[PDB]
């Protein structure tokens, strides 16, 4: 919102912006240490050894 005399409201007066997570539902850890990882499935019809 900007008035014609120069007064204005930016997006740091109503909110606080920062790089966060896209989703906060799922979270993992490994032996107590904070960790993330990707679980890999298998397409049916393909061999699981190669």
């Amino acid at each position: 919102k900007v008035n014609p005399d120069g007064s204005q409201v930016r997006l740091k007066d109503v909110a606080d912006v920062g790089l966060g997570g896209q989703d906060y539902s799922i979270n993992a850890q490994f032996n107590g240490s904070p960790a993330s990882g990707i679980a890999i499935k298998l397409a049916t019809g393909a061999n699981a050894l190669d």
Partner: protein, 157 residues
Amino acid sequence: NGQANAMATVQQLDPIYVDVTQPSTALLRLRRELASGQLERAGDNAAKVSLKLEDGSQYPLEGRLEFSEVSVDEGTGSVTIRAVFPNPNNELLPGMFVHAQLQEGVKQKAILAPQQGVTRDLKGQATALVVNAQNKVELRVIKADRVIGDKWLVTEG
């Protein structure tokens, strides 16, 4: 007799007024830092420095600050500051949209890192690479809040 609309306007162009606006959130934060935080005081150099025109160029003559509006408007939460500027050649016109830089306090023992020494990694989080006593290199997350000239005014780290 006493009709509303004018029939002509006469105006004086020397001197000229500059009405700038300032949010009150950054106005009481200045009064908070001026007594307990990073202590600072301007002194006799709190008159003014110059202003910046529409095209971004710099005006040669500096002005003076006398206050005229202690009142917060409800829509923006901003106070108005009045300044007077000499205009000997009528380079300034009434109604122009300008940017005037005022004078906050004078920070002492300030640390200024160059531009290329500071970087921004993942999650933003401005950082630098220091060398300790054992000639290793460390990464230090710093709180670089503003740029002064060709340096960042770094306040932590």
